[PDB]
Structure 1
Amino acid sequence: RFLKVKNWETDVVLTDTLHLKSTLETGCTEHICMGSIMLPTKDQLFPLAKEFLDQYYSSIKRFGSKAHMDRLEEVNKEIESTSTYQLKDTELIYGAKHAWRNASRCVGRIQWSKLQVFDARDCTTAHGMFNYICNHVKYATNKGNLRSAITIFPQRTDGKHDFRVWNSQLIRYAGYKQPDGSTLGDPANVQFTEICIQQGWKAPRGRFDVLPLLLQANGNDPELFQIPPELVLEVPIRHPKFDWFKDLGLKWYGLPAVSNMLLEIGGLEFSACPFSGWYMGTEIGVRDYCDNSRYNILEEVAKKMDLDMRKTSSLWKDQALVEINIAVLYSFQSDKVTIVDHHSATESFIKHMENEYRCRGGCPADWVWIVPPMSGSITPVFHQEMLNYRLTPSFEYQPDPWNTHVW
């Protein structure tokens, strides 16, 4: 029942008891581990609400109090009569923060309790969604001094009136297939860009075109909105040593903001809940720039560095990778836009894990995602055993709405 995790660098051993509260399935079984797979009614709703409210009242040291019992009574009456219920503001804030706390793939959770929650449950139209999202963008960006935030649109009802942000992130670049076979812009976004144009977007047809928002309110057909250009903070990428680096013409945006997940709190489902923090540098320098399926820039940089590209064993890919990641960090830091390096972020996560074991009895963590995509074992998380399990409140991936939607 009680499980131990060992750090092999320090010999520190921690005991996990929190996993006993896990509810949902991992995808693994006693016969098969799926650790590396990316995607592994009134009757159902009351136990979910009760479980949540119990943890909430426990959190504020009022478990088994009259107010605890009265709220449980209130919620039960509301579900029986209306088939759902509404969260109190205090409950919504607690829930959003805990969804982040429970996000096993997130290295940045030392920050979990510092989250600004924007209650957008009074929103009714796609134009309303756009205004809420602009305000989130401006608040979170804060002229480069980034602040974590989430904006929460109305919860699911019958499932035919969902609020959804069609975009995977609030800010991303367009991709276009070229009449010569190559891709201009971000190849990740070709399909979404096409849907945008199909819905009327006038595409600039450049390499770094900020995509418009496609917003769905109340199960309606999604609508197109452009984020005011002056709210989208971008960083030109230069290198502190290589003057030629700026000539690659690279830039990235300052605000990482995931907009396609589903927030579950107390059995209630918030299908539009865009949230934002700040970048860890490797996301941009390793994945966005160097994935073969993305901007794929390793060859160009290595050439400009005049490395021997004839043999893999010269480690030319590795040398150029480090330089790209040095450039990303330098550029953000020079322009006073919040960023964290992978050494700093992983060190903080280990401290967060220790805090969580001490105060909560554990911390669900997914090693496959937590270990950075470069220099893995020179970061402390590589050497740390982690247990992965699912706790609620939670964030869950949801499929692209253009698969599901009927026009």
Structure 2
Amino acid sequence: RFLKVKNWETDVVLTDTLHLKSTLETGCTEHICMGSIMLPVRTKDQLFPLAKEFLDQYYSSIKRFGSKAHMDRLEEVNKEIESTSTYQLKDTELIYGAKHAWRNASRCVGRIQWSKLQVFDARDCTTAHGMFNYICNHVKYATNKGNLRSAITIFPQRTDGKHDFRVWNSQLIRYAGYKQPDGSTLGDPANVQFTEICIQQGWKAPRGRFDVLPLLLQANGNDPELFQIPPELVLEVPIRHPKFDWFKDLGLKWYGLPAVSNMLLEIGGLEFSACPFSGWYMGTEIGVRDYCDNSRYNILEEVAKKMDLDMRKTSSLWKDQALVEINIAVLYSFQSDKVTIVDHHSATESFIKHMENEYRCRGGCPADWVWIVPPMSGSITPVFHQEMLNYRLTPSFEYQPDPWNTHVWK
């Protein structure tokens, strides 16, 4: 089989063979497409085959397929699984898997960087405090004074699912949200539920607008614990506008390190419930989503009022106009403070390049158009005119239930 993909702006066509290896479901039938849907304890019998294909790929990548190191490893694993039920990965395998989980992330436009990832082996960690130390080093190394570096910390893999390691925060660094009795919201509405759990666990919230949330870390299945990330480790950028001198008076600022922490990393059947991972922001995620989604800091009205725009009738595009300035500002502020960041034009052009290379490299590049195209100026970026095939490959990063909806408290 072969599947064709065309770019309606360069007439450039590509052939995908990689999709043949995709096993998992996508949520789509031959009769229904759920492409725009958000979210459409493994037995011994299930584990080995998964371990096998993984180790087969690993070895193939290092050009040692069928070798002696290859077979002995398969025999070693098969045996270990039979007696211990599970199995531990070698460092080189963990490193290989992590990079590939990233490489297979169909919703990630910054994948050109997949190969350059710093993997921290946190499998010897045993307590929440231990996790705090590990996280702190991840944040420090990754931030690098503004010159960001990719990185991921991998904590202990799941055993019986009763002893999971989990990072309760969705991102290692994030602002608190507090619902006021008057119905309004202070801070980031997206984090209100979590902000609550934190206060209910002992966090003394400053009750401000940009309060860096505390980490709630869960080790070996025990109750989660609170910790405050060293302020001197949390790099932040105050947002001002290049020409709008009233912008600085909006009181806005954002953190520099985006590090998702609620996903699950699957490598060769093994599940890693806690695997925080960071890279570096694309302007629009802060500029259009965090600042402008109606359900976030929703700053359009106030940025428009001060821009003195005709907010009488939407056909004036006061919202579109304000959005560009706001994004102008997020990018300008980061550049001025020498903190890594990429704009949607650069990131998307690079992605097309990475994408093409990946077709002539491994016969495909699973991509989710809905998530790849930016939340603004979509059609003036190259990814918009790009056809994409979306399929699941392992290793992978998956969503998982929020830890508070399942955890059995002691």
Q: Which of the five TM-score ranges fits, normalised by the shorter chain?
A: over 0.9
Secondary structure in structure 2 of the residue aligned to 1:279: coil
> Which deviations, in whole Å up to 9, do the C-alpha atoms of 1:246-279 show, x marking residues without a partner?
0000000000000000000000000000000000
* Counterpart-to-counterpart distance in 1, 2:69 and 2:280: 38
* Counterpart-to-counterpart distance in 2, 1:91 and 1:364: 22
Secondary structure in structure 1 of the residue aligned to 2:14: strand
* Counterpart-to-counterpart distance in 1, 2:181 and 2:97: 48
Secondary structure in structure 1 of the residue aligned to 2:291: helix
How far does residue 21 in structure 1 lie from its aligned partner after superposition? Answer: 0.1
Q: Give 2:274's aligned residue.
A: 272
> Which deviations, in whole Å up to 9, do the C-alpha atoms of 1:102-123 show, x marking residues without a partner?
0000000000000000000000
How far does residue 208 in structure 1 lie from its aligned partner after superposition? Answer: 0.3
> Which deviations, in whole Å up to 9, do the C-alpha atoms of 1:322-361 show, x marking residues without a partner?
0000000000000000000000000000000011001100
* Counterpart-to-counterpart distance in 2, 1:179 and 1:20: 54
Secondary structure in structure 2 of the residue aligned to 1:50: helix
Secondary structure in structure 2 of the residue aligned to 1:313: helix
* Counterpart-to-counterpart distance in 2, 1:348 and 1:98: 19
> Which deviations, in whole Å up to 9, do the C-alpha atoms of 1:116-151 show, x marking residues without a partner?
000000000000000000000000000000000000
Runs of 4+ deviating beyond 3 Å: none
How far does residue 406 in structure 1 lie from its aligned partner after superposition? Answer: 1.7
Identity %: 100
Secondary structure in structure 1 of the residue aligned to 2:246: helix
> Which deviations, in whole Å up to 9, do the C-alpha atoms of 1:69-93 show, x marking residues without a partner?
1100000010011001000000000
> Which deviations, in whole Å up to 9, do the C-alpha atoms of 1:187-206 show, x marking residues without a partner?
11111001000000000000
How far does residue 32 in structure 1 lie from its aligned partner after superposition? Answer: 0.6
Identify which range, 364-373 or 178-187, moves more after superposition: 178-187
TM-score normalised per structure 1:
1.00
Q: Give 2:38's aligned residue.
A: 38
* Counterpart-to-counterpart distance in 2, 1:403 and 1:296: 28
TM-score normalised per structure 2:
0.99
> Which deviations, in whole Å up to 9, do the C-alpha atoms of 1:179-227 show, x marking residues without a partner?
2221000011111001000000000000000000000000000000110
> Which deviations, in whole Å up to 9, do the C-alpha atoms of 1:300-343 show, x marking residues without a partner?
00000000000010010000000000000000000000000000
* Counterpart-to-counterpart distance in 2, 1:282 and 1:248: 18
* Counterpart-to-counterpart distance in 2, 1:267 and 1:406: 24
Q: Give 1:8's aligned residue.
A: 8
How far does residue 66 in structure 1 lie from its aligned partner after superposition? Answer: 1.1
* Counterpart-to-counterpart distance in 1, 2:182 and 2:4: 56
How far does residue 50 in structure 1 lie from its aligned partner after superposition? Answer: 0.2
How far does residue 177 in structure 1 lie from its aligned partner after superposition? Answer: 1.0
- Trace 1:48-197 onto structure 2 (pairs within 5 A): 48-197=50-199
* Counterpart-to-counterpart distance in 1, 2:105 and 2:349: 18
* Counterpart-to-counterpart distance in 1, 2:7 and 2:182: 51
> Which deviations, in whole Å up to 9, do the C-alpha atoms of 1:37-74 show, x marking residues without a partner?
00011100000000000000100101011111110000
Match of 1:308 among 300, 307, 310: 310
* Structure 1: runs of 5 or more not aligned: none
Give aligned pairs, total: 407
Identify which range, 140-149 or 62-71, moves more after superposition: 62-71
How far does residue 178 in structure 1 lie from its aligned partner after superposition? Answer: 1.2
Secondary structure in structure 1 of the residue aligned to 2:308: coil
* Counterpart-to-counterpart distance in 1, 2:294 and 2:373: 20
* Counterpart-to-counterpart distance in 1, 2:183 and 2:127: 40
* Counterpart-to-counterpart distance in 2, 1:295 and 1:243: 20
* Counterpart-to-counterpart distance in 1, 2:182 and 2:33: 42
> Which deviations, in whole Å up to 9, do the C-alpha atoms of 1:1-38 show, x marking residues without a partner?
31000000000000000000001100000111000000
